[PDB]
């Protein structure tokens, strides 16, 4: 079921932070790239 | 005055309620290992194993990708066979006649009751001679009786019986007493008076004693655990270590000699100073600690704050800290950073001259204490840190790594006698803190004032005593309470110093405790005088077997484990190592991982870390650990676990018998099974791998194939995969699944266009044994129909479940010894015995 | 092309562990036999077993071996037999970087 | 568990539009395309995961219920500056997750 | 790296210093070692990982 997750020693099992998916850093991607110029082309001549 | 360690410790709470944990059963009966099932017939009947059928269901179905799911499968298996073998007889049914003492049928493994019934006459009382033909031996084994007689039982399981029994055998003699031994030496060492009560008894003469932990432990299986050392020492101390209070010195001895001269104000109008406890005395338990350990915890780095300035404090703790700690040349107690700073403390507090002035020599390198203090020159440059020497800090030039030989464990029965004080005896202290000299403590108070102050050099004349004390007191409390298979081996001891130096780095990693500047000074002026020792101590070496004993008996359980994969390759296939212990973990107490993960969450173990930990031969005997060992040699052959790899198909025609002398079926009622007496002739079997049923089934000739196959007579047998076995009676004609029940699955479904198939194959094998049983209304044709009926499972075992007997062939199985105990003599386990004693006290002051 | 005959080898060399059934293949030639087996067959269209038992399984294994040595010595037997027939194809299977 | 019998049924034509091995240049020619194409592996291949923290206990460690370690690093204990810089992490893991 | 090799709030090590102002020239370590090897060559990638 568990691959090579499996976790032998309680040395790998910490807490959870946070989590992402394809689509979601997808578009976080593309976000970022574009906040980018409006924030450079919008700010300088 | 109060410091404990929980949730290290509510473990070491139900590791002691391991100790309870009775795996024998004590009975006046063994549990029958052979049943009789009556066929209608006087002359034979058909005699079966039990065991099988209870191994038949143990473990779950043995499916192919579930690897986890197999291992467990097994080890229940394994783990039921110790279980049910292990038992001690007492108090046996004995009868009389003609003067012998003769075996009560119920003490020997079958049953006859069914059959009495039929049997003839003469068959009736052939038997009863048998029985009455049954005695009993007497005397011998362990100075004391027992009774001794041979009784049936079933293969695997009466091994463990005999095992069981030897090692009670043992205990009776040689272990018994090397382990009530072993104690009166740790509690010589240790100061603990052992209840010797439980065999003072006086019925004692003829009891029997079952001690199931045996004592002298083994200090390697304990440190054979990979990454162990920090956990060990967590172990150690919430073991071994005492509840104790911090005295002061008096009040007297500043007032005549610092605070002698009022106006003078120096470094040490530090004195007046009192403790800000909350981060001061922690720091100050951390040094004691710390330093009573000794290199295992060092004296780390001491904190940051820009208070590091206040020159009283900082020059104060330089002097302190050079009679208060080791740089030893045997061992360390400090940083090599720490030791710096505090050089360097000490160099300023020299050269801080606000008094008139002496002659101070600076030397070639403008190192701190490269200066000789004139009138008779002490250059300071002894006062340095040299760790491979020793040379400024507290030891120096005395011997505190000596060994007297002889002492419990081995773990390398080292002692530590703080500046030559070989504290083997009651302290006072207000006698022993006499002439002492330390050297390093002498030369510091020639140095002090060849330099300096003699007001400053007279304090510490007159702290001596109470410095001695600290020091002797510590000695006791390191070298005689706290040696345990919890405290570091001396290999490794050796090697914490010369390992810092190297700064190159291994297992076995020095605690890092962040000092107080002003702590230093504190501790100075707190000797240490434990108030009452850890309620642990006396229970402690039992609860250290416990673990040791658990820990090798998971090893044993994976070294045969392990070689699952290449002995049954077909089943675990998907197996990685990974998976074969997490199933062990599994099946194995919870208390036993938590001590391990102390150091595993920290530092991380691989698997090859693991297998090395396996591989290591090193392993505490209990009784647990020889019967789980022997369970698994027993269970090495797998028919005996109740699963083969020989399943075929086979068309094969239902037995329809004539019937013309209907008293002739007297005879075995023509039983017939599944159970193939030999498997088939290789050359007429047709090896089946999914891929090739695939293929066959890719041209619609799957199903053909088959049936040229079974019309050829021939046999075919799918996959090598295990499969669990299953066993099954039957009065007249099973069920059409029993019979027909193909070992396959095939399936066509048709999506899209494209139509796809399913084929599976069967991991539940059932063996039956079909009794015919028949009446007189019956014809001689009855039995016969125009066509066959058939049965396509068969399966092989060469293991003997299920026979065809005679009657006087009954009692053949008697083919095994046993050992019963008196009912008159007493049988009583006394490994709860090891936790009884008392913490010998301190003479208080 | 060393390769080639290096696989073909292997093969064969792995056939012959094959004995008499009362075998537990060393499980790295299992996974050996059933890459190129899989691959064979699926050139061949041959039903070859990767535990052979009947005997026309075993002559479909032969003949797998037999395809393959001559592929690797790059010979041409041609009709030599009724039973027999050689595949060409063999080569590709044994020029797949896919089998060790 | 299924398998593709390649049984094609009398009733059955099959009209197949599109063949599978693909011309990896046909997309890496498209002009510009390096962003989006990028966007589009992650959008496609890239999984679901958690972010894991290591043990507590890597760090500090207790010896006494007073006594316990203390990591160099105590300024690690210090919340995410918002997603303003957590999504800046991601910014990271994506960014070696893409090498160059 | 480098401005924080160089911040010691500890004891002082000796610091070897390179004829070149470019950080990283130093040694540092009563052993001395280069820290010039964790300079930043792309050719090569000295510094960072492998």
């Known amino acids: 079921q568990r691959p090579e997750r499996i976790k032998t020693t309680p040395y790998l099992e910490g807490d959870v932070l946070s989590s992402d998916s394809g689509p979601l850093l997808s578009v976080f991607a593309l976000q970022e790239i574009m906040q980018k110029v409006r924030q450079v082309q919008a700010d300088y001549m | 005055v109060d410091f404990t360690v929980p949730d290290v410790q509510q473990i070491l709470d139900d590791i002691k309620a391991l100790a309870a944990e009775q795996v024998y059963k004590i009975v006046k009966v063994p549990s029958t290992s052979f049943r009789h099932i009556v066929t209608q017939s006087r002359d034979r009947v058909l005699r079966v194993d039990t065991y099988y059928e209870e191994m038949s269901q143990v473990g779950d179905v043995i499916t192919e990708d579930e690897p986890e799911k197999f291992y467990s499968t097994i080890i229940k298996k394994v783990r039921f066979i110790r279980g049910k073998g292990s038992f001690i007889l007492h108090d046996i049914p004995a009868r009389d006649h003609r003067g012998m003492e003769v075996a009560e049928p119920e003490v020997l493994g079958v049953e006859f009751k069914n059959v009495l019934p039929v049997l003839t006459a003469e068959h009736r009382a052939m038997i009863q001679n048998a029985l009455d033909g049954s005695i009993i031996e007497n005397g011998n084994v362990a100075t004391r009786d027992v009774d001794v007689f041979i009784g049936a039982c079933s293969e695997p399981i009466y091994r463990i019986y005999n095992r069981l029994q030897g090692y009670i055998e043992a205990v009776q003699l040689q272990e018994l007493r090397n382990s009530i031994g072993w104690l009166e030496r740790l509690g010589q060492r240790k100061r603990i008076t052992y209840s010797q009560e439980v065999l003072t008894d006086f019925r004692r003469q003829d009891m029997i004693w079952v001690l199931a932990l045996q ?57 007046t100073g009192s403790t800000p406890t909350a981060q001061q005395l922690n720091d100050v338990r951390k040094i004691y600690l710390a330093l009573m350990f000794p290199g295992q915890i060092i004296l780390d780095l001491k904190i940051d704050p820009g208070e590091r300035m206040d020159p009283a404090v900082r020059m104060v703790a330089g002097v302190v800290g050079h009679l208060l700690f080791t740089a030893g040349g045997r061992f360390t107690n400090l940083t090599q950073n720490m030791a710096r700073q505090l050089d360097i403390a000490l160099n300023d507090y020299l050269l801080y001259m606000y008094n008139t002035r002496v002659q101070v020599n600076y030397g070639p390198t403008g190192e701190p204490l490269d200066f000789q203090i004139g009138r008779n020159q002490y250059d300071c440059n002894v006062f340095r840190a040299d760790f491979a020497t020793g040379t400024g800090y507290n030891g120096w030039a005395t011997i505190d790594v000596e060994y007297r030989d002889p002492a419990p464990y081995v773990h390398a029965q080292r002692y530590i006698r703080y500046c030559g004080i070989d504290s083997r005896e009651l302290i006072n ?47 006791q409390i390191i070298n005689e309470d706290l040696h345990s298979v919890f405290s570091l081996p001396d ?7 010369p390992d810092l130096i190297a700064g190159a780095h291994q297992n076995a990693d020095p ?62 296939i998907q197996a990685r190592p990974s998976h074969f212990w997490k199933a062990v973990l599994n099946d194995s107490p919870e208390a036993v991982k938590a001590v391990m993960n102390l150091s595993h969450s920290h530092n991380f173990i691989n698997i090859r870390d693991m297998m090395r930990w396996v591989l290591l031969p090193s392993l505490q005997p209990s009784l647990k650990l020889v019967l789980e060992e022997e369970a698994w040699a027993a269970a090495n052959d797998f028919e005996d676990l109740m699963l083969t790899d020989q399943v075929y198909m086979h068309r094969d025609m239902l037995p329809e018998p ?21 498997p088939p002739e290789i050359d007429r079997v047709v090896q089946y791998t999914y891929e090739i049923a695939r293929l066959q089934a890719n041209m619609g000739q799957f199903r053909a194939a088959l049936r040229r196959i079974m019309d050829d007579d021939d046999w075919v047998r799918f996959g090598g995969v295990l499969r669990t076995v299953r066993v099954k009676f039957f009065d007249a004609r099973p069920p059409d699944d029993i019979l027909q029940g193909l070992p396959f699955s095939y399936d066509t479904n048709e999506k899209g266009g494209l139509s796809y198939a399913t084929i599976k194959y069967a991991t539940e094998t059932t063996i039956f044994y079909l009794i015919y049983n028949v009446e007189f209304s019956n014809t001689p044709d009855s039995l016969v129909l125009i066509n066959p009926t058939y049965t396509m499972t068969k399966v092989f075992i060469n293991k003997r479940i299920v026979e065809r007997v005679r009657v006087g062939q009954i009692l053949a199985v008697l083919n095994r010894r046993f050992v019963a105990y008196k009912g008159k003599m007493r049988i009583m386990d006394i490994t709860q015995s090891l936790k009884m004693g008392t913490k010998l006290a301190a003479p208080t002051v | 092309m060393d390769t080639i005959a290096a696989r073909a080898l292997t093969v064969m060399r792995a056939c012959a562990t094959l004995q008499e059934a009362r075998i537990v293949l060393e499980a790295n030639v299992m996974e050996i036999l059933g890459i190129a087996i899989n691959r064979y067959n699926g050139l061949t269209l041959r039903g070859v077993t990767m535990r052979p038992t009947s005997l026309a399984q075993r002559n479909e294994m032969f003949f797998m071996c037999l395809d393959m040595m001559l592929s690797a010595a790059g010979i041409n037997v041609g009709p030599i037999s009724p039973d027999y027939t050689q595949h060409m194809a063999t080569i590709g299977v044994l020029a797949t970087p896919e089998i060790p």
């Open chain 2, 215 to 271: 004592l002298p432990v083994n200090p390697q299986v304990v440190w054979d655990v990979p990454r162990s050392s920090i956990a060990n020492l967590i172990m150690n101390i919430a073991t071994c270590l005492p509840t104790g209070e911090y005295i002061a010195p008096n009040p007297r001895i500043s007032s005549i000699t610092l605070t002698q001269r009022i106006t003078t104000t120096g470094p040490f109008a530090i004195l």
């Open chain 2, 491 to 497: 290999d490794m001891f050796n090697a914490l110093l």
């Open chain 2, 429 to 475: 202290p207000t006698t022993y803190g006499i002439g002492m000299t330390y050297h390093c403590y002498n030369e510091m108070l020639r140095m002090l004032v060849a330099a300096g102050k003699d007001s400053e050099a007279a304090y510490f004349r007159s702290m001596l005593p109470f410095h001695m004390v600290r020091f002797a007191r510590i000695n």
């Open chain 2, 658 to 678: 004539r019937l013309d002398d209907i008293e002739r079926f007297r005879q075995e009622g023509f039983y017939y099974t599944n159970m193939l007496e030999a």
């Open chain 2, 511 to 572: 605690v890092v405790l962040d000092v107080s500047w002003i702590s230093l000074w504190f501790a100075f002026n707190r000797s240490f005088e434990p108030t009452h020792r850890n309620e642990m101590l006396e229970i402690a070496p039992l609860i250290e077997s416990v673990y040791a004993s658990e820990l090798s008996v998971m090893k044993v359980d994976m070294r045969h484990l392990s070689l699952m994969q290449r002995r049954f390759p077909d089943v675990l």
